[PDB]
Amino acid sequence: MENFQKVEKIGEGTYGVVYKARNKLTGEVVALKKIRTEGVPSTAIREISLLKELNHPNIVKLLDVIHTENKLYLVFEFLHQDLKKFMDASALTGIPLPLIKSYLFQLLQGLAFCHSHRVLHRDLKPQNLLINTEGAIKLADFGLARAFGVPVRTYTHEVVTLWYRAPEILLGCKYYSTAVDIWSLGCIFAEMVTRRALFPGDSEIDQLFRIFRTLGTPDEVVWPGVTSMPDYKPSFPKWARQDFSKVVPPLDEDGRSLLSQMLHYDPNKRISAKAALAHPFFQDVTKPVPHLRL
């Protein structure tokens, strides 16, 4: 990269490779994401160019967009660690509840902001959540399937994670609502608490059935319209819903209650980010600083 200096490769997202780089001129350290190849749509670059204005303390700042040679480069502010790494590093002891609560609260603030601006993330996962030494956590990547789509892998043979995908997506809904982000965040919340992914599916059907085995196979009573969904099959096994206290022990009732609302099957009953911020679980929220080893 003529203007930069790919310090190190720090990821390989579902579109391209992310590098840590220094602006040889400004000297600023940034995350540079290279995107795939035969001209690159102008509709996306306009969708992207729209993200530059989406600034919030809990959203990774998109600094520059550069189109050149069937290659699209996205320049983002750099953060030192992602939540996946932090969770793995905290696996022995667990992330303290107050920090879990702070991170959840901040991510809901970030989502309330995006959603009020009619922007959906669509692919929330621990690897797309970045943290710093000051205790902030920010939303990164944003997918962009409305300006690109769901990739078969990433760009070069890679197993896309389905663990955080909302059921309406798995059932073939063609129009996603902001509810898909609340579902993913609920899955991440559970994972921070238990130190185990909630629904670790290894295929779309296994992902769906893992959800059904835990929350019960949905029906018209809890999810009006579900049996008419594109990929719904009357032949799906009928599993009973599991007691919620068994899913995220030892989370307190306030936490369970909020998680249950973030995981409602019906996208329309699923709690909004705005409403979640008002939940009693956050009455005593604070902003602890994490112990980060960089």
Ligand X SMILES: NC(=O)c1ccc(Nc2nc(N)c(C(=O)c3cccnc3)s2)cc1
Minimum gap (Å) between residue 132 Cβ and ligand X: 10
Pick from 71, 75, 68: which is nearest to 21 by CA? 75
Minimum gap (Å) between residue 115 Cβ and ligand X: 20
Dihedral (CA of 248, 250, 251, 252) sign: positive
Q: Is 287 in the site for ligand X (CB under 6 A)?
A: no
DSSP structural state of residue 198 = S
Q: Which stretch binds ligand X (CB under 6 A): 99-107, 114-122, 125-133, 284-292?
A: 125-133
Binding mask 194-233 for ligand X (x = CB under 6 A): ----------------------------------------
Q: Which stretch binds ligand X (CB under 6 A): 70-78, 105-113, 150-158, 224-232?
A: 70-78
Pairwise CA distance, residues 282 & 255, whole Å? 9
Pairwise CA distance, residues 223 & 142, whole Å? 27
Q: Is 94 annotated as a binding residue?
A: no
Q: For residue 261, which phi and psi values (nearest 5 degrees)?
A: -75, -25
Q: Is 123 in the site for ligand X (CB under 6 A)?
A: no
Q: Is 16 annotated as a binding residue?
A: yes
* Candidate residues 90, 102, 128, 272; the one interacting with ligand X per rule CB under 6 A: 128
Beta bridge partner(s), residue 20: 8, 31
* Candidate residues 19, 21, 31, 72; the one interacting with ligand X per rule CB under 6 A: 31
Region 85-104 residues binding ligand X, contact defined as CB under 6 A: 85
Pairwise CA distance, residues 6 & 185, whole Å? 31
Instruction: Give me 101's structure tokens.
Output: 């609560």
Q: Is 202 annotated as a binding residue?
A: no
Q: Is 18 in the site for ligand X (CB under 6 A)?
A: yes
* Candidate residues 34, 58, 59, 81; the one interacting with ligand X per rule CB under 6 A: 81
Q: Which stretch binds ligand X (CB under 6 A): 122-130, 195-203, 254-262, 280-288?
A: 122-130
Q: Is 10 in the site for ligand X (CB under 6 A)?
A: yes
Pairwise CA distance, residues 76 & 62, whole Å? 4
> What are the C-alpha distances in Å from 179 to residues 208, 273, 274, 277?
17, 9, 12, 15
Pairwise CA distance, residues 10 & 21, whole Å? 10
Among candidate residues 88, 123, 202, 284, the one labeled active-site is 123
Q: How far is CA 142 from the centre of its chain?
A: 8
Pairwise CA distance, residues 123 & 152, whole Å? 14
Q: Is 48 in the site for ligand X (CB under 6 A)?
A: no
**Can 123 be counted among the known catalytic residues?**
yes
Q: For residue 33, which phi and psi values (nearest 5 degrees)?
A: -105, 120
The annotation places the binding site at 10-18, 33, 77-79, 82, 125-128, 141
Contact footprint for ligand X (CB under 6 A): 10-11, 13, 18, 31, 33, 60, 76-82, 85, 127-128, 130, 140-141
The catalytic residue positions are: 123
Binding residues for Mg(2+): 128, 141
